[PDB]
Amino acid sequence: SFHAELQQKGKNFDMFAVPYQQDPALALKEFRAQLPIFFSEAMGYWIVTRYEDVKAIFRDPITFSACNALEKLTPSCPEALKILEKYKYGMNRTLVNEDEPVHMERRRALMDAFTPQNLEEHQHFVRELVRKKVDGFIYKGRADLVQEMLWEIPLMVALHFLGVPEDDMQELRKFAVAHTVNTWGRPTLEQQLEVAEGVGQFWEYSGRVLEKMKNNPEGKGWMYDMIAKNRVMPEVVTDNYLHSMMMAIMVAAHETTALASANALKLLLADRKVWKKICDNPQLIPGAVEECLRHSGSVVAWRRQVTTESEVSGVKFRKGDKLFLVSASANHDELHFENADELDIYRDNAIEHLTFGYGAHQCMGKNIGRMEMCIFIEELSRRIPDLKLCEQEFTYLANTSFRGPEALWTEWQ
Numbered sequence: 321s322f323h324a325e326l327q328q329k330g331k332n333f334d335m336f337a338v339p340y341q342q343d344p345a346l347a348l349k350e351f352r353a354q355l356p357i358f359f360s361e362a363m364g365y366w367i368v369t370r371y372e373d374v375k376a377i378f379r380d381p382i383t384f385s386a387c388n389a390l391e392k393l394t395p396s397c398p399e400a401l402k403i404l405e406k407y408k409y410g411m412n413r414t415l416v417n418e419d420e421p422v423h424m425e426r427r428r429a430l431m432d433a434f435t436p437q438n439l440e441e442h443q444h445f446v447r448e449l450v451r452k453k454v455d456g457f458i459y460k461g462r463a464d465l466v467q468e469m470l471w472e473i474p475l476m477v478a479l480h481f482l483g484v485p486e487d488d489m490q491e492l493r494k495f496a497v498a499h500t501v502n503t504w505g506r507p508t509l510e511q512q513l514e515v516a517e518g519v520g521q522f523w524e525y526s527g528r529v530l531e532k533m534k535n536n537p538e539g540k541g542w543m544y545d546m547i548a549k550n551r552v553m554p555e556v557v558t559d560n561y562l563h564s565m566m567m568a569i570m571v572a573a574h575e576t577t578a579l580a581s582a583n584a585l586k587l588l589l590a591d592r593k594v595w596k597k598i599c600d601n602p603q604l605i606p607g608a609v610e611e612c613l614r615h616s617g618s619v620v621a622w623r624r625q626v627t628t629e630s631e632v633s634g635v636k637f638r639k640g641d642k643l644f645l646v647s648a649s650a651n652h653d654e655l656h657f658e659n660a661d662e663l664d665i666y667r668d669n670a671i672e673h674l675t676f677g678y679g680a681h682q683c684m685g686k687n688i689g690r691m692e693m694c695i696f697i698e699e700l701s702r703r704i705p706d707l708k709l710c711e712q713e714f715t716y717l718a719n720t721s722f723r724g725p726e727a728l729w730t731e732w733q
C-alpha cells in the first residue's frame with residue numbers, strides 16, 4: 321500500500337505545505353517515479369510532474385489554454401471583491417494568458433522590440449547599474465545582495481525597457497507583492513483586504529501611467545510600442561489589453577529576473593568548486609546561468625486550463641480541468657536530465673529546461689533575464705572572487721509558482 325499511500329499523498333498534495341515550500345522538485349520526486357500525473361483535491365488542480373508531459377501540454381495551446389495563467393488561485397472573499405469594484409479593476413487578457421487563434425499570436429507577432437540591437441543597448445545599461453551598485457557596497461564586509469542590487473536593478477531595467485518613468489520603487493515593489501500574493505498565494509484573512517487594496521491601487525496606478533504615456537507619443541519603450549500598435553490595430557492590441565498588460569508586465573518584466581538571479585548566486589556561491597571555475601572562466605557563466613535556470617529557476621509551476629476532453633500519458637482531462645505544470649519537477653526529471661538534482665554547469669542540454677515555458681507562450685523576455693543574470697555573476701565573481709554565503713536561514717514568499725530567497729546574506733574581504 322506504498323502506492324496506495326502515494327495516491328493519498330497526491331490527493332492531499334498542498335503546495336503551501338512544508339515540503340513543496342522547501343523544495344518543489346524534491347516534493348514531487350516520488351510522484352515523478354510512480355504517480356506522474358495526479359489530481360490534488362487540496363488545490364483543485366491536476367499536478368503534472370514529468371518533463372515529457374509538461375512539454376506536451378505546453379506544445380498544444382488549443383487543448384490546453386493559458387486563460388487561467390493569471391487567474392487568482394484562491395477565491396476572493398466578498399469584501400475583497402468590492403475593494404476591487406471600487407477601483408473598477410478590469411484585469412483580463414494580456415499575452416501570457418491570452419488564448420487565441422493568433423489573437424495571442426497576432427498580438428505577439430506584431431510586437432517585437434526584442435531585437436538584439438535594442439537588447440544590446442539595454443545590456444550596456446544593466447552593466448552600468450551593476451558596476452555602480454557594487455561600487456557602493458564593495459567596501460562593506462557583508463551585505464544582503466537582495467537589498468543591495470538584486471531586486472532594485474531588474475526593476476529599473478524593466479521600467480527602462482518599458483516606457484515607464486521611475487518613481488517610488490518601494491511602492492512599485494509592494495505593488496508587485498500584492499499582485500503575486502493575490503494571484504499565486506494564499507493570503508490570510510487579515511491580509512486579503514490589504515492585498516485587494518494593493519491590487520486595486522496597482523490597477524489605478526497603471527491606469528494613470530498608461531494615460532500619460534498615451535499623451536506622449538515621443539516615447540520610446542515597449543509600452544509605447546503597444547500604445548502605438550493600438551492606434552493602428554485596436555482590434556488586436558485592445559485598450560483593455562493595454563491596461564491589463566501595463567499592470568501584469570510591470571511585475572513580470574523584473575520580478576522573475578530578480579528571483580532567478582538570487583537563486584543562481586545562492587546555487588553557485590555554495591559550490592566553491594563551481595564558483596572558482598566561474599571566477600577563473602567567466603566564459604562559463606552563460607552555460608552556468610542556464611543550468612541555474614534549469615536547477616532552481618524562478619518559475620517553478622505554471623498553469624493551463626483544459627478546453628476539450630483530452631488525455632496525457634493515460635490520464636483523461638475534462639473540459640475545464642485546471643492543470644499545474646510543475647516545471648521545477650520537469651527540470652529534475654531523471655528521464656530527461658542525467659543526475660538531475662546535481663548542479664553541472666555544462667550539462668549539454670541544460671537549455672532544454674522548461675523554466676521559460678515552451679512553444680506558443682514561451683517567455684518573450686528570456687534573453688533579458690539571461691543577460692541580467694550573467695552581468696550580476698560576472699561583476700560579482702570578477703571583483704569579489706572570495707564571495708561566500710553567510711550562514712543564514714532562507715525564507716520564501718509562500719506561493720505556488722514563483723521562487724527565490726527573500727534575503728541573500730553574503731561576505732568577503
Ligand code: HEM
Binds near residue numbers: 378418481686
Ligand atoms: C528569469 C526570468 C523569467 C522567467 C523564469 C520567465 C518565465 C516565463 C514563463 C514560464 C512564461 C510562460 C511560458 C509559457 O506559457 O510557455 C513567460 C512568458 C512571458 N514572459 Fe517571462 N520570464 C522571465 C522574465 C521575463 C521578462 C524580463 C520579460 C519582459 C521584459 C518577460 C516577458 C514575458 C512575456 C511577455 C511573456 C508572454 C509571451 C506569450 O504569452 O506569448 N519575462 N515567462
Ligand SMILES: N[C@@H](Cc1c[nH]c[nH+]1)C(=O)O
Binds near residue numbers: 416568572
Ligand atoms: N509573471 C510571470 C509570467 C508572466 C507574466 N506576464 C508575462 N509573463 C513572470 O514574471 O515571469
